[PDB]
């Protein structure tokens, strides 16, 4: 298939939608690692493997300020925390488990919400 919708339709509609995916992600039993900032100064690899590290510790603060109230806008930083953290974290030891679960659970919401449209 080939369509790539990713249309949030209404901005406000996304505000509470991303708040929905996040609200369950913030209280997720595996989002603990995503609730903190990396080093951004002594963390080798970033600024190269982690284009947009991001993290609920600082990202969740935007949903309150409507800094990511759209399609890829919010999914970019969130999907980034999942795809960039896995770009280095073990393929399945301690970090992958969270990025795997969170990426799996929030999917049903962003997919039904109209974020992944896949």
């Amino acid at each position: 298939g080939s369509h790539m919708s990713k249309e949030p339709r209404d901005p406000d509609q996304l505000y509470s939608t991303l708040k929905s995916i996040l609200q369950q992600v913030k209280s997720h039993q595996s989002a603990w690692p995503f609730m903190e900032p990396v080093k951004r100064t002594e963390a080798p690899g970033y600024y190269e493997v982690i284009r947009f590290p991001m993290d609920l510790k600082t990202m969740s603060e935007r949903l309150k300020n409507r800094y990511y109230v759209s399609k890829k806008l919010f999914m970019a930083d969130l999907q980034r925390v999942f795809t960039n953290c896995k770009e280095y974290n073990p393929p399945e030891s301690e970090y992958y488990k969270c990025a795997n679960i969170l990426e799996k659970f929030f999917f049903s919401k962003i997919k039904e919400a109209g974020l992944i449209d896949k």
Binding site: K39, A43, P44, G45, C85, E87, Y88, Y95
Partner: peptide, 11 residues
Amino acid sequence: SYGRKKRRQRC
């Protein structure tokens, strides 16, 4: 070498 995710490098 790749990401790090460790303690704070004390310089």
